[PDB]
Amino acid sequence: EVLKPRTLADLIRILHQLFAGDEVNVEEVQAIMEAYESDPTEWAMYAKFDQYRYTRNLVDQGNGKFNLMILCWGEGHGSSIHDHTNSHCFLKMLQGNLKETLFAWPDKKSNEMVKKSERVLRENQCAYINDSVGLHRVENISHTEPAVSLHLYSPPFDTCHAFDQRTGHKNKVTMTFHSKFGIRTPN
Numbered sequence: 395e396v397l398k399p400r401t402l403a404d405l406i407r408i409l410h411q412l413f414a415g416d417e418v419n420v421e422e423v424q425a426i427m428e429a430y431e432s433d434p435t436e437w438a439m440y441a442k443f444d445q446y447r448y449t450r451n452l453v454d455q456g457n458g459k460f461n462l463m464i465l466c467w468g469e470g471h472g473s474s475i476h477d478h479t480n481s482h483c484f485l486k487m488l489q490g491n492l493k494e495t496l497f498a499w500p501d502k503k504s505n506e507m508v509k510k511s512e513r514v515l516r517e518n519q520c521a522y523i524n525d526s527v528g529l530h531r532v533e534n535i536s537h538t539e540p541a542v543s544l545h546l547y548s549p550p551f552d553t554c555h556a557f558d559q560r561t562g563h564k565n566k567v568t569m570t571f572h573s574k575f576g577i578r579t580p581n
């Protein structure tokens with residue numbers, strides 16, 4: 395009975411409705427994002443890759459309620475261990491596979507960080523995280539194929555923290571966009 399978007403445009407339209415109000419049903423959003431069947435013809439214009447690290451490509455600003463973006467992971471590309479600045483964060487696979495490792499939060503004492511969960515996100519799967527769930531790292535499982543993911547963050551945010559797996563120490567990071575609406579940013 396899950397509402398199934400037939401196109402990415404459909405999905406965006408639904409998301410505008412689901413985030414219009416004050417409450418967001420996380421499980422409902424997750425199921426509808428998962429139900430969209432990734433179609434590369436519909437998102438190729440956002441899939442702009444870089445040789446050395448993943449790229450963040452803005453798709454939609456959600457009437458200020460969320461950022462919707464596509465992240466392009468080249469061969470072997472991965473993220474830092476990071477938090478999500480008190481937002482809801484949905485991650486759906488569009489191509490390939492990402493390994494998600496969930497980490498416990500450090501305390502002030504320096505220590506090796508503790509893994510709480512490790513999984514591979516399957517085709518079209520939508521995962522969910524917020525700061526109460528934990529920290530995470532995501533990485534392309536493949537050194538021969540890319541991965542592409544669709545991220546919805548609500549409310550939008552432009553900074554987070556990256557964490558050193560050896561110590562738990564963190565640094566603030568300002569996130570930048572490689573492209574917006576299919577158009578490369580100045581860089």
Ligand SMILES: [Fe+2]
Nearest residue numbers: 476478483530
């Ligand atoms: Fe993340």
